[PDB]
Enzyme design. Structure first.
Site, short mmCIF file in Angstrom:
data_model
loop_
_atom_site.label_atom_id
_atom_site.label_comp_id
_atom_site.label_asym_id
_atom_site.label_seq_id
_atom_site.Cartn_x
_atom_site.Cartn_y
_atom_site.Cartn_z
N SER A 175 1.33 -3.11 4.14
CA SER A 175 1.49 -4.82 4.25
C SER A 175 0.88 -5.00 2.64
CB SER A 175 0.83 -4.90 5.78
OG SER A 175 -0.80 -4.82 5.82
N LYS B 232 0.07 3.57 -2.51
CA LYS B 232 -1.25 4.61 -2.94
C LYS B 232 -0.85 5.45 -2.96
CE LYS B 232 -4.19 1.34 -1.41
NZ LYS B 232 -4.34 0.35 -0.08
N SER C 66 0.81 -0.80 -0.18
CA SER C 66 -0.17 0.01 0.12
C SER C 66 0.82 1.35 0.30
CB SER C 66 -1.38 0.25 1.36
OG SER C 66 -2.48 -1.36 0.94
B1 LIG Z 1 -2.23 -1.81 2.02
O1 LIG Z 1 -0.75 -2.90 1.44
O2 LIG Z 1 -2.44 -1.64 3.18
C1 LIG Z 1 -3.10 -2.37 3.96
C2 LIG Z 1 -3.58 -2.68 2.60
C3 LIG Z 1 -3.90 -4.68 2.91
O3 LIG Z 1 -4.25 -5.71 1.65
O4 LIG Z 1 -3.23 -2.92 1.29
#
Ligand SMILES: *[B@@]1([O])O[C][C]([C][O])O1
Length: 261
Positions: free
Chosen positions: A210, A46, A43
């Site tokens: 994660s 993002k 993530s």
């Molecule tokens: B990102 O990595 O942060 C939380 C979500 C869990 O799938 O993705």
């Protein structure tokens, strides 16, 4: 140096593979541990999707207010905010905030769609001089974090440099940059990661990540009180597919970095 010795010892104690990149904007010095090795972003990617939409809003001045429909089919595995607006709409600003501050996976997928697919997020990276970032998949499969798989990876050095440009540099317009900083500072998922290794008086904006193989990531901009800001990227992954998250490793790495400044 002392810090690389301690980071190496921390890595050895953890049983995993640790990647660290610190940029000290005071003198532009860098501290790197496995800084040119690829890690699964999970993530932390993002941030790039949100920044890419922010760049779009520099020309489409109203873009962030564009409503986007949340359908039941859009929901994936982790959607704490999008869940609250099924069969309704969220603006691109609200989806960006959700992706960053709550790591909402549905929100991230809407940002990717707005950019024309993963290739659109990767294109933005190249446009701002990041030749290492690659986004290949959508949520949730970009979190598989398979050892050696180059998909959806970057290096700590590359991500640190890019995060610096997005938040402290001028890869984004002034208003977009400030919006990104505000979003990062209001992250809600980072209390146990980099933040936990730093003085409570320091202001931190971060994005956690994660995934499988116990992958536990955090990227952060740090504003120490009365001192030039720092960019810190901590990536950690493990050899067992079902390993537990190790946010303590990220906190400990930040603590080791803080010792010395
Ligand atoms: B990102 O990595 O942060 C939380 C979500 C869990 O799938 O993705």
């Amino acid at each position: 140096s002392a810090v690389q010795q301690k980071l190496a010892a921390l890595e050895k104690s953890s049983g995993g593979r640790l990647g660290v990149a610190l940029i000290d904007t005071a003198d532009n010095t860098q501290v790197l541990y496995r800084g040119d090795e690829r890690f699964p972003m999970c993530s932390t990617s993002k941030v790039m999707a949100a920044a890419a939409v922010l760049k779009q809003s520099e020309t489409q001045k109203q873009l962030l207010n564009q409503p986007v429909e949340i359908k039941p089919a859009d929901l994936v595995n982790y959607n704490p905010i999008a869940e609250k607006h099924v069969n309704g709409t969220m603006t691109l600003a609200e989806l960006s905030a959700a992706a960053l501050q709550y790591s909402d996976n549905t929100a991230m997928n809407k940002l990717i769609a707005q950019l024309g697919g993963p290739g659109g997020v990767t294109a933005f990276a190249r446009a701002i001089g990041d030749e290492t970032f690659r986004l290949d998949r959508t949520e949730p499969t970009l979190n598989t974090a398979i050892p050696g798989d180059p998909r959806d990876t970057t290096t700590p050095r590359a991500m640190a440099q890019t995060l610096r440009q997005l938040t402290l540099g001028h890869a984004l317009g002034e208003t977009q940059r400030a919006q990104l900083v505000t979003w990062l500072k209001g992250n809600t998922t980072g209390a146990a990661s980099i933040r936990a290794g730093l003085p409570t008086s320091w202001t931190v904006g971060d994005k956690t990540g994660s995934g499988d193989y116990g992958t536990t990531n955090d990227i952060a901009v740090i504003w120490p009180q009365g001192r030039a800001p720092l960019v810190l990227v901590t990536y950690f992954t493990q050899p067992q597919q079902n390993a537990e998250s190790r946010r303590d490793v990220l906190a400990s790495a930040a603590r080791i970095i803080a010792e010395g400044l």
